Amino acid sequence: TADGPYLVIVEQPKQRGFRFRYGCEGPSHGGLPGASSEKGRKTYPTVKICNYEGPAKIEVDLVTHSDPPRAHAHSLVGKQCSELGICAVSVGPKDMTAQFNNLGVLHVTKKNMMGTMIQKLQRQRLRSRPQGLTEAEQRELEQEAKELKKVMDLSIVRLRFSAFLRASDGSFSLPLKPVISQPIHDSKSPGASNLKISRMDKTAGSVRGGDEVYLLCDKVQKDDIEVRFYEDDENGWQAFGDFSPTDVHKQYAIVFRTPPYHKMKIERPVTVFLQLKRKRGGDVSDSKQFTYYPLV
Amino acid sequence: TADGPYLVIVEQPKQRGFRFRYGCEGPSHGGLPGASSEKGRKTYPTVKICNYEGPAKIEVDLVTHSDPPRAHAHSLVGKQCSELGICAVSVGPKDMTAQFNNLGVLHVTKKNMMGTMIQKLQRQRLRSRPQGLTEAEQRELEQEAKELKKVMDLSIVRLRFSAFLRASDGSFSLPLKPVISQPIHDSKSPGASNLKISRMDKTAGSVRGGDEVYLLCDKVQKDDIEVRFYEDDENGWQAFGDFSPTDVHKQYAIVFRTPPYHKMKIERPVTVFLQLKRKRGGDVSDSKQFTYYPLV
DNA sequence: CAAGGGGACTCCCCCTT
DNA sequence: AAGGGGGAGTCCCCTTG
């Protein structure tokens, strides 16, 4: 069961909106916010130790998106942080919640990746033999690095919180179970981010369809994009906008013809939803309302 | 025109649509077309020697956009061309026209600009002293390069045709006047492309204006773009679209409200033009028609 | 391949406060 | 400067023939 002391993520990071920064760009470009942040009501990743009150140390580090949680080529930078990418905070005996309001992600160069990665692999399995390392092991350490650089997603990271309860000594030597956050996408990384409908020229139509709408959106590859018109309650009607890739303008607009509603001769207007859908994927835009009107 | 023999550009290069290629990208990415090219009917830069029939040699090279024509950091690459960027063709005594259907522009790196530059300058003022060069002159040769690299536009080039009449010897040793073409813009270079109206949602209105139009365009700068609605008669009637920069969507759409026509209570619809205008500049889109209708 | 095109990786900036 | 953002280089790739 839960019974023993455990860490819990009180407020997860934003899965979508964060830009990873390269070494060149700067260290002061803004902190990884919470999933609940708004331009004014800002929130930061928070975690809490439950089933214990007292002095404690929580540390965060970047791990892979892969279930087997291996350390990431990327490093966390900030006021609280080590050079190895490890951020450490102290919870007072009163307040067992730790906020991380200044977390940045240093984006490793593909020319950098292996050296930066063996450095980490060293630091990590050098306490396993603290005097030195064998060439045999250093050959095989480079072997992990290589096989990891071939599969490693540099667009997606996960925060890993490792909580440590300070003992009687003064030593923060007791471990808790490590808690991994949900994935974090690089917003300035290849597409597949948050589909957005900025505005559309019409929000209404006849039940017949064929009415041409100009839809302004965030970047949508002609390849992977549709215009899904659906009702959710009513056993899920679904139909699509009538557009050729030529009709998707510089990946920021769609000129499409509305589809007909499933049931003609409706006595009165029927409100439906439309949304962007990646057919290749399954992601969706924030859906807007559309009204279908009756005939003559 | 000069009585003596002279070159004339029969068909100029396309001022607008050509991409300059970097060394990495490839050598086979398409030839600099004529100002008259279409996707069916393709045309290439052509020049002719007039006021002479016989064997002759025409060579093309890239010169600065600056009126005093200096050799450009960029080089011409192709089937006909030298490593120094100089393309050479031979006109037989019958046909005194030279077509250049395979001209590419190698785009120099900013890290390689000075070296590539001193190389064409050595080549150029090494025939002025063909045994060697003085360090003093090589100090001052580097001085030309430096002062040129400060002011050189790497987005704009001009073709320079140098025609040479073969003499009795067999030597193509007689010069004609060199003819410089109109400027050639890098299409994949910063801003300053052709304002284009892709499509608009409405082409019509009431004389009253205030009708909202969604216009899809090529990239425009939010601050320094406008929507000029004008009548061709030098009466000048001109007015503008109504929109905030917020209304210019990801620089590829404009949502604006039509202006009122100058003269209300017309009894017949009046056709006007609208166009994009850079107010900062004076560059215009290809203008589309708009119809103003009467009231109630 | 030729003849086009489009879209990442690293970096370099600018507006706002 | 802290806390956002878009732009620009050079490159590394895709359409159709």
Numbering used by the authors:
A (entry chain A), B (entry chain B): 34 to 329
Sentences from the study reporting this entry:
Mammalian NF-κB is assembled combinatorially from five subunits, p50/NF-κB1, p52/NF-κB2, RelA/p65, c-Rel, and RelB, into homo- and heterodimers which bind to specific DNA sequences, known as κB site or κB DNA.
We mutated the central and flanking bps to generate PSel (mutant A/T-centric) (5′-GGGGTAACCCC-3′) and (−1/+1 swap) (5′-GGGGAGTCCCC-3′) DNAs. PSel (mutant A/T-centric) showed twofold reduced reporter activity, while both PSel (−1/+1 swap) and MHC-κB showed drastically reduced transcriptional activity as compared to the natural PSel-κB. However, compared to previously known structures of NF-κB-DNA complexes, two striking differences are observed. The swap of T and A at ±1 positions reverses the geometric conformation of bps at both positions. Comparison of MD simulations and crystal structures suggests that upon binding to p52, the −1/+1 swap DNA experiences more disruptive conformational change than the natural G/C-centric PSel-κB. Unlike the natural G/C-centric DNA, the binding on both strands of −1/+1 swap DNA draws the bound thymine in the opposite directions of the minor groove, breaking the intra-bp H-bonds and severely distorting the central bps. Upon p52:p52 homodimer binding, the central minor grooves of all three DNAs narrowed, resulting in a consistent trend as seen in the free form.
